[PDB]
Amino acid sequence: SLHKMSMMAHRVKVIPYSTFRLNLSVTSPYNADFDGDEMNLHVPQSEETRAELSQLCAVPLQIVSPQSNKPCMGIVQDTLCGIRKLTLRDTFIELDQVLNMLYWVPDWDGVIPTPAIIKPKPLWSGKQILSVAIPNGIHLQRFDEGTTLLSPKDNGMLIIDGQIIFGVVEKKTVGSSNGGLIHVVTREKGPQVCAKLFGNIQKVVNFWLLHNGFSTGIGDTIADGPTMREITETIAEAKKKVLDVTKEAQANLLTAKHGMTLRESFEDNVVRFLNEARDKAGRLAEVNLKDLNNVKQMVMAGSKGSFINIAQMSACVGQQSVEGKRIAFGFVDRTLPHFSKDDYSPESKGFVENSYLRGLTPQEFFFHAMGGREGLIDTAVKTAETGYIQR
Amino acid sequence: ASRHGQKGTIGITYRREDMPFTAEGIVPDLIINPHAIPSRMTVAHLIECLLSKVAALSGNEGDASPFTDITVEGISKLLREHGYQSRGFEVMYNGHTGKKLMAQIFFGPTYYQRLRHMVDDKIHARARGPMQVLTRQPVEGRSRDGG
Amino acid sequence: EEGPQVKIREASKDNVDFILSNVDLAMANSLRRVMIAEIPTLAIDSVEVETNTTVLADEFIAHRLGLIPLQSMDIEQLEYSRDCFCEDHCDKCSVVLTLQAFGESESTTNVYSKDLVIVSNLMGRNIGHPIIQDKEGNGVLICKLRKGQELKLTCVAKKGIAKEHAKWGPAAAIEFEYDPWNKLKHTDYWYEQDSAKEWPQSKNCEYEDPPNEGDPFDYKAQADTFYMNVESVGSIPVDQVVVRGIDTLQKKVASILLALTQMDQD
Amino acid sequence: FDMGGYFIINGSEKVLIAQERSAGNIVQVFKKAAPSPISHVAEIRSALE
Amino acid sequence: TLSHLRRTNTPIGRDGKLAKPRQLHNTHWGLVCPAETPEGQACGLVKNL
Amino acid sequence: DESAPITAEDSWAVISAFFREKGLVSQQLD
Amino acid sequence: MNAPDRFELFLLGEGESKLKIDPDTKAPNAVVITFEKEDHTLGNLIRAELLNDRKVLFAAYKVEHPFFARFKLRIQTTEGYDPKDALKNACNSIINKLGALKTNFETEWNLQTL
Amino acid sequence: RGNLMGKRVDFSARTVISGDPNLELDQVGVPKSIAKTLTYPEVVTPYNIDRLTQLV
Amino acid sequence: MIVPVRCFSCGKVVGDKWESYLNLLQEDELDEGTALSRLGLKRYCCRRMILTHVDLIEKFLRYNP
Amino acid sequence: MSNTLFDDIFQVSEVDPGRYNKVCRIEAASTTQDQCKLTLDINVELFPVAAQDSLTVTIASSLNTRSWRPPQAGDRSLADDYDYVMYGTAYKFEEVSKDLIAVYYSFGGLLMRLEGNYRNLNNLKQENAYLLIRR
Amino acid sequence: FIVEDDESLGHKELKVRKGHIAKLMATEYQDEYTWSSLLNEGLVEYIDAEEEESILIAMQPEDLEPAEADVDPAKRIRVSHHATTFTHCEIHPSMILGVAASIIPFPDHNQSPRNTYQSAMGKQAMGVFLTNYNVRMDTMANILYYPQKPLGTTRAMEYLKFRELPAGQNAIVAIACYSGY
RNA sequence: CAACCAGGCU
DNA sequence: AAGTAGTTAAGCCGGTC
DNA sequence: ACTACTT
Ligand SMILES: [Mg+2]
Ligand SMILES: [Zn+2]
Ligand SMILES: [Zn+2]
């Protein structure tokens, strides 16, 4: 229990089956995931006692948090990843179903709103119905990058009188962001209205996604043929960009950067090269992945994974390291007994050229391990150390 | 759990009539969420499936051993050899309506371990009960009925 | 004939590939499902162990006796123990099978779906016969046993559908597909280079006129003609899993009218 | 299939766990901290095998 | 049962944590498994052959 | 050519022979 | 342990009634009907058909939450035309269609071999 | 530290949690077996004499 | 550990096909891959079933009382 | 106001589908005022569009509103004498200096921009606004 | 493996040769030429940590030996046998692992830590710890009804006896968002 | 309703 | 200048005395 | 580990 929010008041809803079921947007505050995590529940006992809970610590109230003057709950996973797709101009929805989506929203004034498209076939736009969730008067304006009142890229976000005028919806809008659709609805309509908004939004989006479906698998991890080769040389060239600086230091022709050894200044240059390359190898694939790519879609919405993720899966994992210094010579002047002494080449100080699609080599593997093993350690240190501080 | 530190708990269970399906009839036993793959970066899972979808078809114990000369490429080609999409995906229909699913799912087998620790051996509740003797506070342990 | 036609492509004793034409996807699926889970069957549902020395524990075995398909031709004239008035059960609501095995052979004695012995009177009606499609006529190996391992049970098959539990299911798989050349754009093929290249076209691509560029998008496009295939397990004949399907789904829709009726009076 | 390698004390299957440590009799040199009357050290832990 | 039979303990210490030993060594290659070790707590202190 | 080189797959046969004799819990025993 | 009884999926429990009709207020001449111990199977279909009766301004249905066998159906119709009836018809239609489809599948089947 | 600043308590329950896209943010699904364990002392009042006798 | 009756995934009886498969391998010196296609096990849900089952029961029977 | 509020025909300068399988933002100028420029996203699946084209654009606040009804209009009023009619709301009424004023319309996503300066008493800033296209 | 350049008919090369191998599978099939033999016949040798210091090793026996006189784009990318000092060769890298990690499919395709988990989580699964469970009276114990070996496998399995005593099943899994549960 | 040693899960 | 005690995350769940 | 007052 780290902050107020780790403890909140909920309404009992007796259901069957042995598990405590809670909504998901309230998952974030406790830090709850379902790999088998448990949660305790205390039952108030006095009339005035439950009052304190219902009036002072009910989830609805905890929504916009003082820890950092912004909402602390918002849309996540499915609902989120799925709210994006439901938005894009590209996405149109037809009557028979729109009618269901309409119904699903427990408020809906039971007034089918005119399709944007009447022409040959009466079509409704994602945004359109989604907006039936957004109450009235909620006013919002964003402007991301190439945003422009006619936002081509379908950027930023414009919602008026509670209806989406333009721009896709994702994390930045319907997340626990600062200028949040949530941050606004809360302050503007009440902690109740907002509370129910998560609901409505969810039930629609959730439902729509149920039928539009979504997925992912290896197919989304392999980068285009040439974009791969194009990468194998982005790697390789950096290999020599290194080789040189290496001989150029074996000849004793390098200015020891003020305050640093030659060796100090040496590695420093090396590393900056590899990673530098690594990121590039990455970026390449990142933009090489088209919109239909699932892994990307997820990154776009902001529901999971980011740059470096695609990077290590499709492009190149990168230089593994420990305590700053790349792998070291635990084996008298070398890394493993599969190396000749005094070798400094990347292929020895722990640079993983292979991606995860490809597959590490024994060395690549073991080194990676040594790297991981460090995280797993300070993870178990920067934890209890944190604990004592927090107390 | 899978074989990739991919632990998880059930949340609901549906019967075939509700489960999504592939025109060929087959339906899933599990349905894990795409989201716990991009961040976890556990590609092996993905691959194990493709290789096992095949091995299941061809009936030849798939070799997913560490450092081998196998490749998704090889595996993809051989799966295409059996008529199913090259990467694994297939198109599926929504068991409720029967309409197609605008997307295609990553279908195919995977070895999953049912691990110890099941809800019913945990779910515990107490409202007044056994009390310690020194402390006069509630005893400890669901097994002793403590709070 | 009149409304939604059929046109059985192949067909056998264990499958009925056919083409459901001129129907609503809704209806097609509805039927699809009804077949899968609400068609009444018959299966062992109560097992009274008197003796067992096998290596498989009581319930282990019981569980199985449930999936051992039984004859359910006239299941439609047997009663749901629950609706019958006999305190518990009777010949009017259930079948009683028996099993008794003893390892005599010095070599692994095998217990099969065949060794089941009906004891209750079937008041003359195909029901309760351990369905066998096995080539040697033994079907479903219930369990093996050593030297002197015995095993004496008693079974009591009752009505029951799939919703209640799987063993009462009769379908087991059901191919379902439509619009093989994505014409209504109900999907959005994933790919690297080419949709067509990477994505296998189906057997049914034939029975329907390929796309052909030029033409604009047929948005008025509905969806009839479904290439199905109702396999079967035995309990009931492939044809049945489809007729009785078409029926039950009908009686179901029926009751809704009937309900609307009593509703009026009060 | 049992591969043994364990014991059976008072009934339950007990396993003696491998214990790790620094090999005896061997010389090693270690440097000292900034505050230290000593610079370096030569250590050898002698143990009659 | 197997993996338990090939497990090793490595006495903690006062200034525990650090990583002098909780770390994965080069010398370790081939002798001890790189991936298998307990999460948190005695992480890397218990190794598997 | 009972003396030609040795490729990949061959490794296994050796390993097999290893555990044949030694056995997963060797150390504990010896 | 806290598992319901499988059969509750279809056995109208003591004092429940397949149908229950409550008039929607948010809009005129349209009603909401609760179908107990039923599911998509029946729902989607009664929803589909209802989508034909042109005198039906609105029709949708939703399964409240998986755990429970039941769904709400909302039907809105042009004035003077009562929804209850609209439901009625689309029901029959569904049967009639099925009847044919039954007949026809049998026809086919008899003219077969193997 | 472990008796006064914190302690074991009555009327408390705990099991495995699982998300449900069908509950209002502020609700919490409680298993029957647990609702039937945990109780709440409620005073008899002309306001509830009825409901309450029903339950008793 | 005895042949599962019916397929977890589609339910198609599969208890009988045990011995048959075991023979279309031993005697009929055939390859699993098709030995199954032989027994009628089309799609993988069912294939996986037989192909993988581990008939431990035998090893069990080889015990005593 | 059951009466049109703008009319003309433009010729497709160029139609664009940036990452949009079923929608294209298009542009064309007026074959009258050399002031009337136009931008309009179009569902080019339910009305294809190829550059250089005689297209009629209209506006108006009707079609001869509330709970949108189905067809039933087998025979009803229908200013549908076109082959693509949308509906949306007007948000911006920008003044590109001079006497040139542009307005923005959005139809649940699909946007649009008009030019000139003659709908002085016509292009009201109202939500109302069915867009229509013919030929 | 010992690689002594004893090749008076070429370069530096592995002691053991295709004959040795076939003379082993020989006795394998007979279920005389054991492990012990591979040892005494100075073909394979036990090199500890300390001694490991003063030696050079080749990962792949082959690949890392013959001369350099196209390259698969799908395969990974290895360095090479740049040297001839190779005194020993790795029987097979896979062996750096351990009982746990050995059952992990494609561990050379997972972000490192992911594998440390499967390493202690697998110690929490169910299966058939022995075949005589029926005769054992241990406090607590679980046996999976119908265990299946796995579709995906590892050459390491074989010796760990995984396929005869699995610990899970092969589930027709689908990766997609559905009801949202 | 004991402790103390010990081990394990998130 | 070394040394030597205290604090060291939080909750839940087999063996001798 | 890490800080204080002892050693
Ligand atoms: Mg967790
Ligand atoms: Zn009876
Ligand atoms: Zn199957």
Side-chain angles (χ1 to χ4, degrees), chain C residues 159-177:
Chain C
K159 204 138 174 189
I161 79 182
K163 290 182 162 186
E164 237 285 52
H165 180 273
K167 65 188 180 178
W168 283 294
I174 277 191
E175 324 228 336
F176 192 96
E177 178 192 301

PDB file of all heavy atoms in Angstrom, chain C residues 159-177:
ATOM      1  N   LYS C 159     -30.938 -37.992 -20.248  1.00  0.00           N
ATOM      2  CA  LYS C 159     -31.029 -37.050 -21.356  1.00  0.00           C
ATOM      3  C   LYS C 159     -29.960 -36.004 -21.160  1.00  0.00           C
ATOM      4  O   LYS C 159     -28.877 -36.337 -20.723  1.00  0.00           O
ATOM      5  CB  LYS C 159     -32.394 -36.392 -21.375  1.00  0.00           C
ATOM      6  CG  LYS C 159     -32.781 -35.875 -22.726  1.00  0.00           C
ATOM      7  CD  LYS C 159     -34.243 -36.205 -23.001  1.00  0.00           C
ATOM      8  CE  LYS C 159     -34.742 -35.589 -24.308  1.00  0.00           C
ATOM      9  NZ  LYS C 159     -36.220 -35.727 -24.482  1.00  0.00           N
ATOM     10  N   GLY C 160     -30.239 -34.746 -21.480  1.00  0.00           N
ATOM     11  CA  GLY C 160     -29.223 -33.722 -21.276  1.00  0.00           C
ATOM     12  C   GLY C 160     -28.547 -33.179 -22.523  1.00  0.00           C
ATOM     13  O   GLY C 160     -28.255 -33.912 -23.458  1.00  0.00           O
ATOM     14  N   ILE C 161     -28.279 -31.878 -22.526  1.00  0.00           N
ATOM     15  CA  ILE C 161     -27.656 -31.237 -23.667  1.00  0.00           C
ATOM     16  C   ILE C 161     -26.243 -30.788 -23.367  1.00  0.00           C
ATOM     17  O   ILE C 161     -25.702 -31.108 -22.316  1.00  0.00           O
ATOM     18  CB  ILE C 161     -28.462 -30.031 -24.125  1.00  0.00           C
ATOM     19  CG1 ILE C 161     -28.189 -28.851 -23.219  1.00  0.00           C
ATOM     20  CG2 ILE C 161     -29.932 -30.337 -24.048  1.00  0.00           C
ATOM     21  CD1 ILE C 161     -28.983 -27.666 -23.610  1.00  0.00           C
ATOM     22  N   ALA C 162     -25.654 -30.031 -24.289  1.00  0.00           N
ATOM     23  CA  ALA C 162     -24.281 -29.573 -24.139  1.00  0.00           C
ATOM     24  C   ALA C 162     -24.103 -28.477 -23.114  1.00  0.00           C
ATOM     25  O   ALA C 162     -23.133 -28.480 -22.360  1.00  0.00           O
ATOM     26  CB  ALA C 162     -23.747 -29.121 -25.463  1.00  0.00           C
ATOM     27  N   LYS C 163     -25.024 -27.525 -23.088  1.00  0.00           N
ATOM     28  CA  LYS C 163     -24.910 -26.457 -22.119  1.00  0.00           C
ATOM     29  C   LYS C 163     -24.690 -27.082 -20.757  1.00  0.00           C
ATOM     30  O   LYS C 163     -23.829 -26.642 -20.016  1.00  0.00           O
ATOM     31  CB  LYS C 163     -26.170 -25.607 -22.105  1.00  0.00           C
ATOM     32  CG  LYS C 163     -26.372 -24.756 -23.331  1.00  0.00           C
ATOM     33  CD  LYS C 163     -27.625 -23.943 -23.172  1.00  0.00           C
ATOM     34  CE  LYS C 163     -27.649 -22.790 -24.124  1.00  0.00           C
ATOM     35  NZ  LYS C 163     -28.820 -21.931 -23.844  1.00  0.00           N
ATOM     36  N   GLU C 164     -25.462 -28.122 -20.446  1.00  0.00           N
ATOM     37  CA  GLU C 164     -25.355 -28.828 -19.166  1.00  0.00           C
ATOM     38  C   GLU C 164     -23.939 -29.395 -19.001  1.00  0.00           C
ATOM     39  O   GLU C 164     -23.386 -29.404 -17.901  1.00  0.00           O
ATOM     40  CB  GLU C 164     -26.391 -29.978 -19.087  1.00  0.00           C
ATOM     41  CG  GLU C 164     -27.394 -29.962 -17.890  1.00  0.00           C
ATOM     42  CD  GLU C 164     -26.802 -30.385 -16.524  1.00  0.00           C
ATOM     43  OE1 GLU C 164     -25.767 -29.831 -16.116  1.00  0.00           O
ATOM     44  OE2 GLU C 164     -27.380 -31.261 -15.840  1.00  0.00           O
ATOM     45  N   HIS C 165     -23.360 -29.875 -20.093  1.00  0.00           N
ATOM     46  CA  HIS C 165     -22.014 -30.435 -20.076  1.00  0.00           C
ATOM     47  C   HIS C 165     -21.714 -30.904 -21.457  1.00  0.00           C
ATOM     48  O   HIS C 165     -22.615 -31.174 -22.235  1.00  0.00           O
ATOM     49  CB  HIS C 165     -21.896 -31.618 -19.123  1.00  0.00           C
ATOM     50  CG  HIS C 165     -20.526 -32.228 -19.077  1.00  0.00           C
ATOM     51  ND1 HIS C 165     -20.116 -33.209 -19.950  1.00  0.00           N
ATOM     52  CD2 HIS C 165     -19.481 -32.011 -18.241  1.00  0.00           C
ATOM     53  CE1 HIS C 165     -18.883 -33.577 -19.648  1.00  0.00           C
ATOM     54  NE2 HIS C 165     -18.475 -32.866 -18.614  1.00  0.00           N
ATOM     55  N   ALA C 166     -20.436 -31.021 -21.759  1.00  0.00           N
ATOM     56  CA  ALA C 166     -20.028 -31.436 -23.080  1.00  0.00           C
ATOM     57  C   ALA C 166     -20.472 -32.836 -23.515  1.00  0.00           C
ATOM     58  O   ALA C 166     -21.054 -32.986 -24.587  1.00  0.00           O
ATOM     59  CB  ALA C 166     -18.534 -31.307 -23.199  1.00  0.00           C
ATOM     60  N   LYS C 167     -20.216 -33.853 -22.695  1.00  0.00           N
ATOM     61  CA  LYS C 167     -20.567 -35.215 -23.074  1.00  0.00           C
ATOM     62  C   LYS C 167     -21.881 -35.347 -23.810  1.00  0.00           C
ATOM     63  O   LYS C 167     -22.018 -36.236 -24.626  1.00  0.00           O
ATOM     64  CB  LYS C 167     -20.557 -36.134 -21.868  1.00  0.00           C
ATOM     65  CG  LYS C 167     -21.598 -35.823 -20.850  1.00  0.00           C
ATOM     66  CD  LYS C 167     -21.356 -36.666 -19.626  1.00  0.00           C
ATOM     67  CE  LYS C 167     -22.392 -36.373 -18.574  1.00  0.00           C
ATOM     68  NZ  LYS C 167     -22.191 -37.227 -17.377  1.00  0.00           N
ATOM     69  N   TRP C 168     -22.840 -34.469 -23.548  1.00  0.00           N
ATOM     70  CA  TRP C 168     -24.121 -34.535 -24.258  1.00  0.00           C
ATOM     71  C   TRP C 168     -24.093 -33.888 -25.630  1.00  0.00           C
ATOM     72  O   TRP C 168     -25.104 -33.843 -26.319  1.00  0.00           O
ATOM     73  CB  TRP C 168     -25.239 -33.875 -23.457  1.00  0.00           C
ATOM     74  CG  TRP C 168     -25.710 -34.714 -22.364  1.00  0.00           C
ATOM     75  CD1 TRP C 168     -26.351 -35.908 -22.475  1.00  0.00           C
ATOM     76  CD2 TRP C 168     -25.522 -34.481 -20.970  1.00  0.00           C
ATOM     77  NE1 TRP C 168     -26.568 -36.441 -21.232  1.00  0.00           N
ATOM     78  CE2 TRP C 168     -26.068 -35.581 -20.288  1.00  0.00           C
ATOM     79  CE3 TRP C 168     -24.938 -33.453 -20.231  1.00  0.00           C
ATOM     80  CZ2 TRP C 168     -26.048 -35.682 -18.899  1.00  0.00           C
ATOM     81  CZ3 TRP C 168     -24.920 -33.557 -18.862  1.00  0.00           C
ATOM     82  CH2 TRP C 168     -25.470 -34.663 -18.207  1.00  0.00           C
ATOM     83  N   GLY C 169     -22.943 -33.364 -26.019  1.00  0.00           N
ATOM     84  CA  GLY C 169     -22.849 -32.750 -27.324  1.00  0.00           C
ATOM     85  C   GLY C 169     -22.908 -33.819 -28.398  1.00  0.00           C
ATOM     86  O   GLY C 169     -22.545 -34.979 -28.169  1.00  0.00           O
ATOM     87  N   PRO C 170     -23.387 -33.469 -29.586  1.00  0.00           N
ATOM     88  CA  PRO C 170     -23.402 -34.567 -30.542  1.00  0.00           C
ATOM     89  C   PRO C 170     -22.603 -34.195 -31.771  1.00  0.00           C
ATOM     90  O   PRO C 170     -22.140 -35.052 -32.516  1.00  0.00           O
ATOM     91  CB  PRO C 170     -24.873 -34.691 -30.845  1.00  0.00           C
ATOM     92  CG  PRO C 170     -25.273 -33.224 -30.955  1.00  0.00           C
ATOM     93  CD  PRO C 170     -24.473 -32.512 -29.868  1.00  0.00           C
ATOM     94  N   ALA C 171     -22.429 -32.895 -31.959  1.00  0.00           N
ATOM     95  CA  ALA C 171     -21.744 -32.369 -33.129  1.00  0.00           C
ATOM     96  C   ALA C 171     -20.249 -32.581 -33.225  1.00  0.00           C
ATOM     97  O   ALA C 171     -19.793 -33.352 -34.050  1.00  0.00           O
ATOM     98  CB  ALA C 171     -22.050 -30.895 -33.268  1.00  0.00           C
ATOM     99  N   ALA C 172     -19.487 -31.874 -32.404  1.00  0.00           N
ATOM    100  CA  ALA C 172     -18.034 -31.984 -32.432  1.00  0.00           C
ATOM    101  C   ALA C 172     -17.482 -31.489 -33.771  1.00  0.00           C
ATOM    102  O   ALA C 172     -17.303 -32.261 -34.699  1.00  0.00           O
ATOM    103  CB  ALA C 172     -17.611 -33.430 -32.179  1.00  0.00           C
ATOM    104  N   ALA C 173     -17.212 -30.188 -33.837  1.00  0.00           N
ATOM    105  CA  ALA C 173     -16.693 -29.512 -35.027  1.00  0.00           C
ATOM    106  C   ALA C 173     -17.845 -29.173 -35.944  1.00  0.00           C
ATOM    107  O   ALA C 173     -18.897 -29.769 -35.850  1.00  0.00           O
ATOM    108  CB  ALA C 173     -15.692 -30.375 -35.745  1.00  0.00           C
ATOM    109  N   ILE C 174     -17.641 -28.197 -36.811  1.00  0.00           N
ATOM    110  CA  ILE C 174     -18.658 -27.773 -37.764  1.00  0.00           C
ATOM    111  C   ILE C 174     -18.027 -26.706 -38.636  1.00  0.00           C
ATOM    112  O   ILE C 174     -17.914 -25.555 -38.227  1.00  0.00           O
ATOM    113  CB  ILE C 174     -19.895 -27.156 -37.081  1.00  0.00           C
ATOM    114  CG1 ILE C 174     -20.847 -28.251 -36.633  1.00  0.00           C
ATOM    115  CG2 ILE C 174     -20.630 -26.245 -38.048  1.00  0.00           C
ATOM    116  CD1 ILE C 174     -22.195 -27.749 -36.183  1.00  0.00           C
ATOM    117  N   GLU C 175     -17.613 -27.078 -39.839  1.00  0.00           N
ATOM    118  CA  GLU C 175     -16.978 -26.124 -40.739  1.00  0.00           C
ATOM    119  C   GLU C 175     -17.980 -25.033 -41.092  1.00  0.00           C
ATOM    120  O   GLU C 175     -19.160 -25.293 -41.292  1.00  0.00           O
ATOM    121  CB  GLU C 175     -16.473 -26.838 -42.009  1.00  0.00           C
ATOM    122  CG  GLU C 175     -15.911 -28.276 -41.776  1.00  0.00           C
ATOM    123  CD  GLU C 175     -14.540 -28.550 -42.431  1.00  0.00           C
ATOM    124  OE1 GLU C 175     -14.189 -27.865 -43.428  1.00  0.00           O
ATOM    125  OE2 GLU C 175     -13.822 -29.469 -41.948  1.00  0.00           O
ATOM    126  N   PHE C 176     -17.497 -23.806 -41.172  1.00  0.00           N
ATOM    127  CA  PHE C 176     -18.364 -22.686 -41.470  1.00  0.00           C
ATOM    128  C   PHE C 176     -17.565 -21.610 -42.194  1.00  0.00           C
ATOM    129  O   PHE C 176     -16.539 -21.168 -41.697  1.00  0.00           O
ATOM    130  CB  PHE C 176     -18.907 -22.141 -40.155  1.00  0.00           C
ATOM    131  CG  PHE C 176     -20.030 -21.167 -40.314  1.00  0.00           C
ATOM    132  CD1 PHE C 176     -21.354 -21.590 -40.208  1.00  0.00           C
ATOM    133  CD2 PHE C 176     -19.771 -19.825 -40.561  1.00  0.00           C
ATOM    134  CE1 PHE C 176     -22.413 -20.688 -40.342  1.00  0.00           C
ATOM    135  CE2 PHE C 176     -20.821 -18.916 -40.697  1.00  0.00           C
ATOM    136  CZ  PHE C 176     -22.147 -19.352 -40.586  1.00  0.00           C
ATOM    137  N   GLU C 177     -18.029 -21.191 -43.366  1.00  0.00           N
ATOM    138  CA  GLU C 177     -17.328 -20.165 -44.136  1.00  0.00           C
ATOM    139  C   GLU C 177     -18.215 -19.495 -45.168  1.00  0.00           C
ATOM    140  O   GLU C 177     -19.221 -20.057 -45.578  1.00  0.00           O
ATOM    141  CB  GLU C 177     -16.132 -20.768 -44.854  1.00  0.00           C
ATOM    142  CG  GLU C 177     -15.389 -19.767 -45.707  1.00  0.00           C
ATOM    143  CD  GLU C 177     -14.389 -20.430 -46.627  1.00  0.00           C
ATOM    144  OE1 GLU C 177     -13.483 -21.127 -46.108  1.00  0.00           O
ATOM    145  OE2 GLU C 177     -14.516 -20.253 -47.867  1.00  0.00           O
TER     146      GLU C 177
END
